[PDB]
Amino acid sequence: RPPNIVLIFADDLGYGDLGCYGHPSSTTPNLDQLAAGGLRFTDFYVPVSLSTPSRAALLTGRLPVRMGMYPGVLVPSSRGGLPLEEVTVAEVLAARGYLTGMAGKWHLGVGPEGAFLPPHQGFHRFLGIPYSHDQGPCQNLTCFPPATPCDGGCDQGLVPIPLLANLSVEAQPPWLPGLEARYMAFAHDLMADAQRQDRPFFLYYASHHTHYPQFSGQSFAERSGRGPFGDSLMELDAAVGTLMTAIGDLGLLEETLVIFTADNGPETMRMSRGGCSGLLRCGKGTTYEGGVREPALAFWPGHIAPGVTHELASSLDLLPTLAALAGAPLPNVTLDGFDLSPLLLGTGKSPRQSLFFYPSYPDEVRGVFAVRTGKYKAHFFTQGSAHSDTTADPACHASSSLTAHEPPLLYDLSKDPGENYNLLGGATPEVLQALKQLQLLKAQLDAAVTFGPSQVARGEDPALQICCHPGCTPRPACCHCPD
Amino acid sequence: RPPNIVLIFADDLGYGDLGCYGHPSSTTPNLDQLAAGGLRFTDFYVPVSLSTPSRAALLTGRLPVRMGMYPGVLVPSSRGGLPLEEVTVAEVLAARGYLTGMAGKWHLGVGPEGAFLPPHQGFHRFLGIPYSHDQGPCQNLTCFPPATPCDGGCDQGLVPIPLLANLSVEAQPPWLPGLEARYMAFAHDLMADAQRQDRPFFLYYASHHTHYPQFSGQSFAERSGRGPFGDSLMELDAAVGTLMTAIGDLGLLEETLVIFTADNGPETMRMSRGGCSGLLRCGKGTTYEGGVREPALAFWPGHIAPGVTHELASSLDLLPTLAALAGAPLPNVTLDGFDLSPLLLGTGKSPRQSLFFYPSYPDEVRGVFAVRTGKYKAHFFTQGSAHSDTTADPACHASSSLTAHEPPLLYDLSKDPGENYNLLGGATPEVLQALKQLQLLKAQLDAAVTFGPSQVARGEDPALQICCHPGCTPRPACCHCPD
Numbered sequence: 019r020p021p022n023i024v025l026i027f028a029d030d031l032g033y034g035d036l037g038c039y040g041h042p043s044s045t046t047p048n049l050d051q052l053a054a055g056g057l058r059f060t061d062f063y064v065p066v067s068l069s070t071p072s073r074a075a076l077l078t079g080r081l082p083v084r085m086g087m088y089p090g091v092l093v094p095s096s097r098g099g100l101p102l103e104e105v106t107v108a109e110v111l112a113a114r115g116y117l118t119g120m121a122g123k124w125h126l127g128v129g130p131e132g133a134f135l136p137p138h139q140g141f142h143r144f145l146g147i148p149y150s151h152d153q154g155p156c157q158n159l160t161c162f163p164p165a166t167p168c169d170g171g172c173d174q175g176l177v178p179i180p181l182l183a184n185l186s187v188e189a190q191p192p193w194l195p196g197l198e199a200r201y202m203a204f205a206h207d208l209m210a211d212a213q214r215q216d217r218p219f220f221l222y223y224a225s226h227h228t229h230y231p232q233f234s235g236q237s238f239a240e241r242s243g244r245g246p247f248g249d250s251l252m253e254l255d256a257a258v259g260t261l262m263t264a265i266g267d268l269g270l271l272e273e274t275l276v277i278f279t280a281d282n283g284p285e286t287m288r289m290s291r292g293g294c295s296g297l298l299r300c301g302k303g304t305t306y307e308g309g310v311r312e313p314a315l316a317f318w319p320g321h322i323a324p325g326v327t328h329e330l331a332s333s334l335d336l337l338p339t340l341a342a343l344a345g346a347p348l349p350n351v352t353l354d355g356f357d358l359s360p361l362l363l364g365t366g367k368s369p370r371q372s373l374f375f376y377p378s379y380p381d382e383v384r385g386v387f388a389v390r391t392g393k394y395k396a397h398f399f400t401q402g403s404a405h406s407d408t409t410a411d412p413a414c415h416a417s418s419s420l421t422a423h424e425p426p427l428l429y430d431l432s433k434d435p436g437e438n439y440n441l442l443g444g445a446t447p448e449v450l451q452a453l454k455q456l457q458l459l460k461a462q463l464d465a466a467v468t469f470g471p472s473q474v475a476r477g478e479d480p481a482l483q484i485c486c487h488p489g490c491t492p493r494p495a496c497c498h499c500p501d
Numbered sequence: 502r503p504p505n506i507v508l509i510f511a512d513d514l515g516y517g518d519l520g521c522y523g524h525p526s527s528t529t530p531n532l533d534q535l536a537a538g539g540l541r542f543t544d545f546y547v548p549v550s551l552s553t554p555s556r557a558a559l560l561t562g563r564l565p566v567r568m569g570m571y572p573g574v575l576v577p578s579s580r581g582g583l584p585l586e587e588v589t590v591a592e593v594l595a596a597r598g599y600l601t602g603m604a605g606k607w608h609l610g611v612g613p614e615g616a617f618l619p620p621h622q623g624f625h626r627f628l629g630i631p632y633s634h635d636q637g638p639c640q641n642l643t644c645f646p647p648a649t650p651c652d653g654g655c656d657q658g659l660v661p662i663p664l665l666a667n668l669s670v671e672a673q674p675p676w677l678p679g680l681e682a683r684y685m686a687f688a689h690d691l692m693a694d695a696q697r698q699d700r701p702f703f704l705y706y707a708s709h710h711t712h713y714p715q716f717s718g719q720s721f722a723e724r725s726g727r728g729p730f731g732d733s734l735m736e737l738d739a740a741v742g743t744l745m746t747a748i749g750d751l752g753l754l755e756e757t758l759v760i761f762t763a764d765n766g767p768e769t770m771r772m773s774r775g776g777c778s779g780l781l782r783c784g785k786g787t788t789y790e791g792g793v794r795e796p797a798l799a800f801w802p803g804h805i806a807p808g809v810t811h812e813l814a815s816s817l818d819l820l821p822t823l824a825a826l827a828g829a830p831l832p833n834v835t836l837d838g839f840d841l842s843p844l845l846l847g848t849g850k851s852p853r854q855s856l857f858f859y860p861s862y863p864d865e866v867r868g869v870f871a872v873r874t875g876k877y878k879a880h881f882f883t884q885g886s887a888h889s890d891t892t893a894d895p896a897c898h899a900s901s902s903l904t905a906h907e908p909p910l911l912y913d914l915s916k917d918p919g920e921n922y923n924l925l926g927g928a929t930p931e932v933l934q935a936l937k938q939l940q941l942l943k944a945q946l947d948a949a950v951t952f953g954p955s956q957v958a959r960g961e962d963p964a965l966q967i968c969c970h971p972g973c974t975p976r977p978a979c980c981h982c983p984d
């Protein structure tokens with residue numbers, strides 16, 4: 019019998035946000051304990067620094083550019099979404115007799131009759147928002163009780179964010195200070211049912227947590243010490259705790275594999291209400307460490323030895339890793355990941371020796387922007403980001419345009435993870451030997467990988483906006499059904 | 502019977518260097534365990550971001566500007582040093598019947614016949630270099646065995662660094678790849694003797710560790726994963742381990758209070774071979790968090806509850822804290838510190854509510870550069886530093902000259918410890934109320950504190966350079982006695 023997999027996927031969390039990762043004020047008790055009793059990756063990456071592509075790669079285990087999950091992210095009125103031909107981790111496990119279930123943010127397309135929603139991609143049960151919770155007007159919405167409004171107002175001219183239970187709207191807009199509660203409930207039931215069915219569950223908890231606007235329940239409002247972002251993180255931390263408790267009460271501790279990560283770097287344009295990359299450079303939207311290197315914590319008593327690994331690993335490896343643990347047959351499609359089970363089980367090292375990064379807006383001409391092999395990371399193309407704005411380092415700002423590099427900026431991450439000192443900026447046979455390998459790795463991938471038809475380029479059709487009242491007037495303002 | 506105090510004082514270590522503080526490659530096993538089994542301060546500060554003044558404040562418990570320990574640091578040919586009228590933590594404990602002992606860097610003056618050396622300031626035994634180990638030519642010196650030279654060559658035109666055993670030279674220059682060994686030996690003996698004398702020991706371990714040039718024994722050379730700086734840190738970590746072991750073998754675990762800290766922020770001009778402030782801003786020489794906020798770890802089983810405190814605390818508080826634990830009578834002099842024992846013993850909160858910072862080169866006209874109260878830190882004067890050069894943020898570079906601020910740059914460290922978003926940059930009654938308190942605190946201190954006669958201004962007399970061969974020729978090149 020395979021393990022009970024629980025894959026938590028935080029939204030917009032930085033490398034230096036968790037308490038166990040070095041943040042001064044952040045309050046993350048449950049996660050620190052999870053990290054104290056299980057593996058803690060120091061070098062865990064994501065292929066792209068954005069929600070849509072990152073999430074796409076997590077579920078399919080393939081590079082975003084293959085399935086056309088570019089450029090940028092999907093909006094509510096988008097026509098495209100994650101192709102059904104693409105097999106997700108949920109589909110692979112479902113066939114293995116798993117009771118799959120998702121709670122929260124999808125952001126992988128909605129389409130016509132909801133053809134791109136979770137139920138069609140492999141999940142049995144679902145409860146959550148089809149996209150980023152800020153992609154809908156939030157002027158009237160309350161982020162913190164009793165009646166503290168959400169700052170910014172979010173995206174205007176759009177239908178209020180709906181809370182989809184499978185394929186039907188349960189609320190619109192859902193009460194944010196209590197949205198989290200519904201997810202934990204949905205989780206507990208999913209696990210309980212799976213237990214009394216003698217069936218292994220797969221809980222994909224994609225939290226809206228630490229993505230803007232920052233929201234929380236009365237139990238966390240001004241209770242973190244780190245303000246709005248802190249309160250929102252404290253809730254995410256509690257959510258992990260309640261899940262661990264629920265699993266504990268069911269006696270499934272040594273029979274449950276828990277994984278935690280974030281989809282991309284901190285949106286620093288959010289300032290005091292945004293994440294923190296820590297020592298890493300820049301954040302969301304950039305190919306710098308601060309935008310692609312996300313935290314990670316493996317937990318599974320009796321199988322996962324408590325420690326800290328520096329082995330190379332990516333979210334692209336989760337599908338094969340989880341498939342291997344479940345004994346589930348791997349798909350025919352060419353996966354860009356590896357089986358990290360040896361690393362987790364402590365029976366060997368990670369197969370990951372090289373990493374490839376693509377920008378927010380990629381293209382077949384330039385190709386991969388950054389490539390890492392061992393401790394060396396080359397930067398063939400550097401670019402700033404609006405998401406990485408307001409910081410002290412000008413290399414992150416949107417002002418910094420796309421610049422080419424020949425030879426590429428070579429960084430020894432083992433001694434310079436902050437990417438401040440370029441080696442080629444001037445050599446050493448070791449460095450020179452690495453340069454050649456990195457330049458070849460790029461060329462070999464660019465030639466092999468072929469960009470799939472851009473889904474985001476399919477266009478926007480406002481008629482696709484999920485409305486609570488079908489055939490309503492005047493849309494979209496008339497689509498309501500609060501709690 | 503009072504506790505066995507062991508005060509470790511690292512040299513040039515950053516906030517984000519230790520593994521338990523969030524560094525990706527740093528290898529610090531022993532220190533992480535020390536931090537896992539005892540208090541870990543997230544907000545621990547030092548009055549000035551330089552060796553001499555910082556160290557002066559540690560031992561005397563008073564602000565560097567009072568005793569004239571400015572401007573900058575003391576050189577080998579300096580005439581001044583820490584005034585004997587000033588009572589150190591060693592003197593207070595000595596009267597309490599403590600077997601005081603120091604190992605390593607002094608950097609608090611040498612003077613004429615060594616009138617400023619440890620033996621005159623309160624230490625019974627001593628073994629270490631009278632100042633920074635880079636303040637002497639290191640072209641021929643070996644930093645890493647078998648024969649890997651020290652980079653940079655260090656300070657030229659000076660007498661090679663001597664290893665002073667009390668008041669007499671034991672070696673000059675001492676073998677660096679084995680200097681650490683001598684200190685640990687000296688420590689073990691100090692503790693053993695104190696034990697068989699039924700007397701409490703006071704071990705002040707001022708390591709040269711992580712100060713340039715980076716050195717290490719064969720047991721750490723290319724063994725840290727983080728290069729030269731990593732190897733040097735791994736040794737410092739081992740040094741802490743061997744001390745813990747020695748204390749363990751003597752059965753003095755629950756009877757020994759261990760404290761770890763650094764004197765100032767990371768010298769970033771050293772680049773890949775320098776420290777790391779982490780999320781904090783700038784480093785050594787600046788009044789920014791990265792230069793004044795140092796790591797800290799309290800350890801004392803059965804008395805120190807394992808946790809992480811965010812309470813305000815400074816190195817200025819160590820003297821009174823340690824004096825209180827030892828039951829030792831506090832000196833008549835006005836101390837700028839507080840008794841942190843309640844915090845350590847978990848019987849209460851810290852008395853520290855405000856912190857004051859002075860620049861590398863201070864003056865009576867400008868006064869304190871930065872003031873902190875609770876979670877707000879004002880910047881009345883900002884300045885860069887040559888020590889903080891080569892970084893990405895231009896506010897740290899020496900290029901950034903001393904600029905005044907009215908109103909001062911107000912930062913809410915609880916949500917913005919990185920000092921990126923100025924509040925007054927534009928308010929909130931809370932902020933406005935804090936501004937007034939901070940502006941008053943500055944004015945009240947500037948008026949009260951009177952600058953003591955600048956010791957570093959006393960001049961340089963080359964005849965004061967410690968020479969192995971007295972009445973030698975041709976000096977200083979002729980002062981030798983290796984191992």
Ligand SMILES: *[C@@H]1O[C@H](CO)[C@@H](O[C@@H]2O[C@H](CO)[C@@H](O)[C@H](O)[C@H]2NC(C)=O)[C@H](O)[C@H]1NC(C)=O
Pocket residue numbers: 142143144145183184204
């Ligand atoms: C999503 O739809 C499925 C049915 O397609 C729901 O599953 C049933 O849920 C009830 C409890 O509400 C159980 O008693 C049934 O055994 C479930 N059937 C199966 C086949 O699993 C599921 O609850 C729905 N979830 C949401 C959030 O709407």
Ligand SMILES: *[C@@H]1O[C@H](CO)[C@@H](O[C@@H]2O[C@H](CO)[C@@H](O)[C@H](O)[C@H]2NC(C)=O)[C@H](O)[C@H]1NC(C)=O
Pocket residue numbers: 625626627628666667687
């Ligand atoms: C520093 O000087 C003191 C004497 O002033 C030395 O102390 C003696 O050390 C020996 C061992 O070497 C002991 O047997 C004596 O009992 C010690 N006497 C006292 C009064 O403590 C000390 O060893 C010297 N240390 C160095 C490093 O030179």
Ligand SMILES: *[C@H]1O[C@H](CO)[C@@H](O)[C@H](O)[C@H]1NC(C)=O
Pocket residue numbers: 155157158495
């Ligand atoms: C709140 O105001 C916004 C415009 O600021 C509008 O879009 C929304 O419909 C209003 N809703 C309520 C409940 O007042």
Ligand SMILES: *[C@H]1O[C@H](CO)[C@@H](O)[C@H](O)[C@H]1NC(C)=O
Pocket residue numbers: 638640641978
């Ligand atoms: C080594 O060379 C330096 C000059 O580069 C000189 O100061 C020193 O005395 C020399 N020592 C030896 C042992 O060669």
Ligand SMILES: [Ca+2]
Pocket residue numbers: 029030068069229281282
């Ligand atoms: Ca995201």
Ligand SMILES: [Ca+2]
Pocket residue numbers: 512513551552712764765
């Ligand atoms: Ca120093």
